[PDB]
Amino acid sequence: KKKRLKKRIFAAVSEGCVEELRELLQDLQDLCRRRRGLDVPDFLMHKLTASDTGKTCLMKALLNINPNTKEIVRILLAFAEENDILDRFINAEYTEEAYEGQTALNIAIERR
């Protein structure tokens, strides 16, 4: 415990269990509530983003694809909309050298 959350959701988005992610978003707002009022972008953009590649949950949501995508994206968008983090979120890019510019929209049209 207390470290699995980054490792859980990246797999949990890949499987597509919708209601299990609702349990994952349940404690996720509580971890922001455990902070004293710290910057919700500058905290969740370390939790939604991997530490090395810069890959978000959202680009992870569109690399893999199942028939659960249309709901799994909007919930990750509505949670990104109910916290005033959306504009930094949707235009996220790879920090990694090999892919500077593989954004969320290029990976959408790739999967057609």
Partner 1 sequence: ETVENVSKESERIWRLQRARTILEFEKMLPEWLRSRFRMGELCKVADEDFRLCLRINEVKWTEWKTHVSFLNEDPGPIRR
Percent helix / strand / coil, the chain, rounded to 5: 60, 0, 40
Q: Does 65 help bind partner 1 (rule: CB under 8 A)?
A: yes
Query: Exposed, middle or buried: residue 55 (CB in 10 Å: 0-12, 13-18, 19+)?
Result: buried
Restricted to residues 92-111, the positions that interact with partner 1 (CB under 8 A) are 98, 102, 111
Nearer to partner 1, 59 or 80 (CB): 59
CA dihedral 61, 89, 5, 66 (to 10 degrees): -10
Of 27-35, 39-47, 62-70, 74-82, which part binds partner 1 (CB under 8 A)? 62-70
Closer CB to partner 1, residue 29 or residue 53?
53
Near partner 1 by CB under 8 A: residue from 64, 91, 100, 105 = 64
Q: What phi, psi does 32 have (nearest 5°)?
A: -70, -30
Given the rule CB under 8 A, which of 35-43, 57-65, 69-77, 82-90 is the region that contacts partner 1? 57-65
Q: Which is nearer to partner 1, 66 or 91 (CB)?
A: 66
Name the site residues for partner 1 (rule: CB under 8 A): 55, 63-66, 98, 102, 111-112
